[PDB]
DNA sequence: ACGACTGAGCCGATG
RNA sequence: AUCGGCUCA
């Protein structure tokens, strides 16, 4: 019911919470650094899990 | 107002304060995980008042007035098991807490 | 279009105005409801923008002359 | 508390808070940009500093 | 910080002026009213006056022929000086100090602002509506005041409430008995009374010792705000202005504090008080020809207070009925002597014994026929027919209309209120559990060593010991705190402990010694979510106790020990139990099970007590309950046994295991008691206890009550009323919820400070004690704030004439109507509960005002002027001779349109002023306890109501296009 | 005659 | 936060 209540339910390591988490890293992908950069391939994107 | 050592927060307890036994400090060997507390510090946020028909009231409860924010040592949101044991070093004049 | 996206490029022709062809497809079927048309296999409105793409459909030919009968519906 | 006319001031500046002053008549938000004297602040938010 | 210059007004007493302050010595403000002239003396703290300034773009009214605004509000170091624009020519830079301002208020009239600078927003007039709304809705509310308090919904408590509320002259006796809260209850209607209207400054009346109780509830059963009077308190009001101490309004002092002194009466009586409220738990007794010292102190008081009330004098004790004191009190005209009354008295013996109901004496012969009478001998006509009737299947019919033949024929009732455990229906029953420990040889080898060193004379110090061995170790023996691996009471602890941790448990022991060694053993030494209940700590702790130990479940389990009294913190849901130590003596006993033992109590209680045999201990857990069963039934007879048995109990108890011609006791004592129980169920006299709980009458009070409690838009209009203002709403894990006063936005005169515990939940919060959020608690402050300030959602824009929307472009420029119909007059004739400020729907364009659907449901579908100078207000210039073309045909549809809903706020007047005072002209021929001074305060009040309601006018507050 | 790697860790010490 | 110290890519 508020942005607070689930600041407990997340925290509390409560199940649900992962069960989102799951629905949310499907589609939604991630960008991998690594330095030096020294080109433009020192950082690539790779869809996680 | 001289910053304290003792448990008197107005907002964390009694929640957290059978991690701390009594009187001032962490008791020797007390599991505590990330967030918990150790010792209880607390500071005045000055505001120093002494309006007439204010004291009886702050008066008949316990005492809450030129004190206090949650400003006690914390455990970092880190892992960190548990204690061994506690050093103190109390100032020259003595006010010597008791579980010290 | 989890996995490579490479028949969906090409369609509106390169991989930038696959950004703003689809950017502006992501956010007409994110914010007023908007119709699901290829079956919206759980997804997200991420994938389905190019995904509309992928079976031919959406392009800037379309999201351009399309939103003048958003401007012929509401008289 | 940033001297009268120093380095630090806020009937310069700015107050050390929001929609307040140094002295304390004024408080939290309703006097927008009402011109104190006693304390000397232009009653706006601090970031004007 | 006081400073001389200033100008207060008044927050009960706005009818004088804007006051110019002219003294200060240390604890005082006197003021000055050049309009009426006169002046207002108050306090620095605690002073119901209010600031009153003006904001930049605003004006000030002055005192001569010129007057505007405004540059820049220029204090020095207390007093302003409103630099304000002159009207009459121009000039840029004029000073007009704000001493020098008008003592009236003409004010900015929300009509004429349009021609100004830039405006307020969107997004807040809705809220603005809303306050008039609810404000509007709640005052024509369906129930005067009863809405939100430190109480469960119950019958009995309400029905007092119900009743006395309405009455004009508060005059009532407050008798129910211990343990079911007759001052909560019976305050009932001292709140009610305020909100009405009719009633400041109440003086209440009641012994030093207990004034802690008593200031705090006040606050927090109904947010009572005390100042107290003492001798402390005395001191600084009588160099604060002298005089009769006006100083505050609701305030506590014993008659200790008037008697002692003897021109303090003096000084108490002239003082146009209202109410007088008195409670006292022993005594105040007058033989004839010879009357009291501290009662005749009162004489005065009553005479001169015009609405009283009594907790009762105390009689419940004892003599069941020797109550003329009490009453000669409330009225000494219909009491002329009391070598009378007791006539009243003996000849209602009968009538109740013989009421039975239907239940104990289902018919009775040709002594009901007579008299029942006496009272309707006289008056005859219908009950000839109706009074034989008992039977032939209408089972509640005849029932339920003779009663107000009678109930309304008492002729102490109307006044009286008894109630006790019978006549209310409201109790969960006592299942005790009984268990018997094995004893250890530590215990043993020490209790024979008692009788050696054991003979003296006297009668208590040899009863105590042995009985009593956890503390009867700790004193006497070598090693203080030893016990704890020893005896099977620690045992007993985890094994029912270690797995019974899921429900939660109350505990009640010997004394705080003993209960801060249990903390310390089982906390950890066996490892529980423990905390501390003893007597000595601070409040917190007792909120922080009750507070850990009423979480939804975190905080299992508290260690109650010595006594508490019957405590206002209700434990609704510690249903379960372990009995620790059986005292000695049933009145201490009974507050152990005090708590749990009333209405609010929900479930069943569970009772669990051990003892281990050849103990003191042993003897009295039968004593108890085979003796006169006081646990599984409530006992105040209790008492009255042990002082009767003292010395023959004693004997047995001193040398425990012994004497085996012992059972006698038990089985005289289930003798004694036993006989008793009936006779005082032919001692009750049911009616005035059927008049004071209710039934049918009282059953729907609640009911109907309970759903509202239920409002999900308190939820969030509330929260979003004081989050705009400029306090945030924070914490939502609990059923609230903190609220810090913020940056953005807000005027000093608030009282929260820095956190704000509170709920919007009756039976949630009732576990606790920490403050309550419905429409009747911190909304005084708030409500004034979204109305009475005027410049707050008074004139914004929005989505209008533009070709940017459709399908209507070109101009069509709609704009909001509403108008207040300010009754014109003040509270005490009850305006505000038949009559309030209403608002009024009105977008017009050239034609009479539209309503199709609600500003709700198009509050979310317009667009402000979200912008700030150069694009911001840019109507402003070439739009003042197009909106009020609207304005002077807009004002003709105002009087149709509220003149409608006056006419139908008099049919309800007119439809119930008149049709309740039947109720009382009436009631006169019953002739129960009614004097003229009731009656001709209806008749005085119906002829100043239509009058109050010819008068009514208008003023705009609203903008929205 | 000029010009001085890309990330963050931990400790320490005085405007 | 500037400087000093020292490790691993
Ligand atoms: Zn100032």
């Known amino acids: 019911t508020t942005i607070k209540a689930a600041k407990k339910m997340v925290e509390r390591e409560e199940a649900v919470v992962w069960d989102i988490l799951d629905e949310v890293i499907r589609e939604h992908p991630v960008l991998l650094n690594r330095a030096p950069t020294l080109h433009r391939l020192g950082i690539q994107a790779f869809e996680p899990v | 107002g001289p910053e304290e050592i003792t448990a008197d927060i107005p907002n964390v307890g009694e929640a957290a304060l059978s991690k701390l036994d009594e009187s001032g400090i962490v008791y020797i060997g007390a599991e505590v995980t990330g967030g918990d507390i150790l010792v209880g510090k607390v500071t005045p946020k000055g505001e120093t008042q002494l309006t007439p028909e204010e004291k009886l009231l702050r008066a008949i409860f316990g005492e809450k007035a030129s004190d206090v924010k949650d400003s006690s040592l914390r455990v970092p949101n880190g892992v960190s098991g548990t204690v061994i044991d506690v050093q103190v070093f109390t100032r020259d004049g003595v006010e010597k807490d008791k579980r010290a | 279009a989890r996995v490579t996206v490479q028949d969906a490029v090409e369609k509106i022709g390169n991989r930038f105005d696959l950004v703003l062809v689809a950017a502006r497809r992501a956010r007409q079927m994110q914010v007023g409801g908007k119709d699901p048309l290829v079956p919206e296999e759980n997804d997200k409105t991420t994938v389905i923008a190019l995904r509309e793409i992928e079976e031919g459909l959406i392009n800037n030919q379309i999201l351009d002359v399309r939103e003048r009968q958003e401007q012929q519906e509401q008289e | ?49 | 910080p006081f400073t001389l210059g200033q100008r207060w007004i008044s927050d009960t007493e706005s009818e004088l002026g804007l006051g110019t302050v002219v003294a200060v010595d240390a604890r005082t403000v006197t003021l000055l009213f050049p309009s009426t002239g006169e002046n207002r003396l108050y306090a620095r703290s605690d002073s119901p006056v209010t600031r009153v300034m003006f904001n930049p773009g605003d004006t000030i009214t002055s005192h001569d022929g010129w007057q505007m605004q405004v540059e820049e509000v220029k204090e020095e170091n207390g007093l302003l000086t409103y630099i304000g624009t002159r009207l009459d020519t121009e000039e840029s830079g004029v000073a007009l100090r704000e001493v020098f301002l008008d003592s009236k208020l003409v004010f900015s009239k929300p009509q004429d602002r349009l021609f100004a600078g830039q405006i307020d927003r969107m997004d807040r007039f809705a809220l603005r509506y809303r306050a008039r709304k609810y404000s509007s809705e709640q005052f024509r509310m369906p129930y005067s005041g009863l809405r939100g308090q430190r109480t469960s919904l119950i019958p009995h408590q309400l029905n007092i409430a119900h009743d006395v509320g309405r009455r004009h002259a508060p005059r009532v006796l407050l008798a129910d008995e211990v343990g079911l809260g007759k001052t909560i209850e019976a305050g009932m209607i001292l709140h009610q009374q305020l909100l009405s209207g009719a009633a400041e400054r109440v003086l209440i009346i009641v012994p030093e010792t207990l004034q802690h109780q008593w200031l705090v509830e006040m606050l927090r059963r109904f947010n009572l705000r005390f100042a107290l009077f003492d001798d402390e308190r005395y001191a600084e009001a009588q160099h604060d202005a002298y005089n009769p101490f006006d100083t505050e309004q609701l305030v506590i002092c014993s008659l200790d504090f008037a008697r002692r002194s003897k021109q303090r009466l003096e000084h108490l009586c002239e003082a146009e008080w209202d109410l007088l409220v008195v409670d006292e738990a022993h005594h105040l007794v007058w033989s004839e020809d010879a009357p009291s010292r501290e009662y005749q102190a009162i004489e005065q008081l009553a005479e001169h207070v015009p609405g009283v009330l009594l907790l009762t004098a105390t009689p419940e004790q004892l003599g069941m009925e020797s109550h003329f004191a009490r009453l000669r009190l409330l009225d000494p005209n219909r009491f002329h002597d009391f070598a009378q009354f007791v006539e009243e008295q003996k000849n209602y013996c009968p009538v109740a014994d013989a009421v039975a109901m239907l239940l104990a004496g289902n018919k009775l012969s040709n002594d009901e026929l007579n008299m029942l009478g006496e009272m309707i001998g006289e008056q005859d006509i219908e009950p000839l027919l109706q009074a034989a009737n008992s039977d032939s299947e209408d089972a509640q019919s005849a029932r339920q209309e003779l009663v107000s033949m009678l109930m309304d024929r008492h002729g102490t009732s109307r006044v009286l209120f008894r109630n006790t455990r019978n006549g209310v229906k409201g109790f969960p029953k006592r299942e005790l559990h009984t268990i018997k420990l094995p004893l250890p040889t530590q215990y043993q080898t020490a209790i024979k060593v008692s009788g050696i060193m054991g003979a003296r004379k006297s009668a208590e110090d040899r009863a105590r010991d042995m009985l009593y061995p956890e503390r009867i170790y700790q004193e006497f023996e070598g090693d203080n705190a030893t016990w704890w691996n020893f005896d099977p009471r620690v045992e007993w602890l985890m094994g029912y402990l270690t797995s019974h941790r899921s429900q939660k448990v109350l505990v009640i022991c010997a004394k705080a010694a003993t209960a801060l060694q249990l903390e310390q053993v089982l906390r950890e030494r066996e490892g529980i979510r423990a905390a501390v209940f003893h007597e000595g700590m601070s409040i917190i702790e007792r909120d922080r106790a009750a507070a850990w130990f009423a979480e939804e479940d975190t905080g299992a389990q508290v260690l109650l020990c010595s006594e508490i009294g019957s405590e206002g913190r209700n434990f609704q849901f510690a249903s379960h139990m372990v009995m620790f130590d059986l005292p000695f003596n049933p009145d201490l006993l009974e507050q152990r099970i005090g708590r749990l033992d009333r209405i609010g109590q929900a479930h069943d209680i569970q009772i669990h007590v051990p003892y281990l045999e050849k103990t003191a201990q042993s003897v009295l857990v039968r004593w108890y309950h085979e003796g006169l069963d006081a646990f599984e039934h409530t006992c105040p007879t209790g008492r009255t046994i042990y002082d009767s048995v003292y010395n023959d109990l004693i004997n047995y108890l001193a040398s425990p295991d012994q004497t085996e011609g012992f059972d006698d006791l038990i089985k005289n004592c289930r003798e004694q008691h036993e006989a008793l129980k009936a006779q005082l169920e032919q001692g009750r006299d049911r009616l005035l206890e059927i008049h004071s709980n209710g039934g049918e009458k009282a059953q729907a009070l609640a009911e109907s009550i309970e759903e509202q409690d239920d409002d999900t838009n308190l939820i969030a209009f509330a929260m979003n009323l004081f989050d705009i203002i400029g306090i945030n709403q924070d914490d939502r894990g609990d059923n609230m919820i903190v609220l810090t006063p913020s940056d953005h936005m807000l005027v000093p005169d608030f009282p929260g400070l820095s956190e704000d515990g509170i709920t919007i939940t009756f039976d949630r919060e009732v576990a606790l004690a920490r403050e309550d959020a419905q429409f009747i608690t911190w909304e005084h402050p708030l409500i004034r704030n979204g109305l009475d300030l005027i410049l707050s959602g008074d004139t914004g824009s929005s989505t209008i004439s533009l070709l940017k929307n459709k399908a209507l472009p070109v101009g069509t420029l709609l704009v909001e109507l509403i108008y207040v119909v300010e009754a014109q007059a003040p509270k005490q004739l009850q305006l505000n509960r038949f009559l309030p400020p209403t608002p009024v729907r009105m977008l017009l364009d050239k034609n009479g005002n539209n309503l199709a659907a609600q500003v709700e449901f198009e509050t979310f579908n317009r667009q402000l002027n979200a912008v700030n100078r150069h694009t911001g207000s840019k109507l402003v210039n070439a739009v003042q001779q197009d909106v009020h073309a609207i304005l002077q045909l807009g004002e003709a549809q105002i009087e149709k349109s509220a003149r409608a809903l006056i006419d139908a706020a008099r049919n309800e007047a007119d439809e119930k002023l008149s049709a309740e005072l039947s109720r009382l002209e009436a009631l006169r021929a019953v002739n129960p306890n009614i004097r003229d001074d009731e009656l001709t305060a209806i008749e005085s009040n119906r002829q100043q109501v239509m009058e109050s309601l010819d008068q009514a006018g208008w003023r705009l507050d609203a903008l929205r296009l």
């Open chain 4, 1 to 49: 508390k940033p001297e009268r006319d120093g380095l630090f001031c806020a009937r310069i500046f700015g107050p050390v808070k929001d929609y307040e002053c140094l002295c304390g008549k004024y408080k939290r938000l309703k006097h927008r940009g009402v011109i104190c004297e006693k304390c000397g602040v232009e009653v706006t938010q601090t970031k004007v500093r």
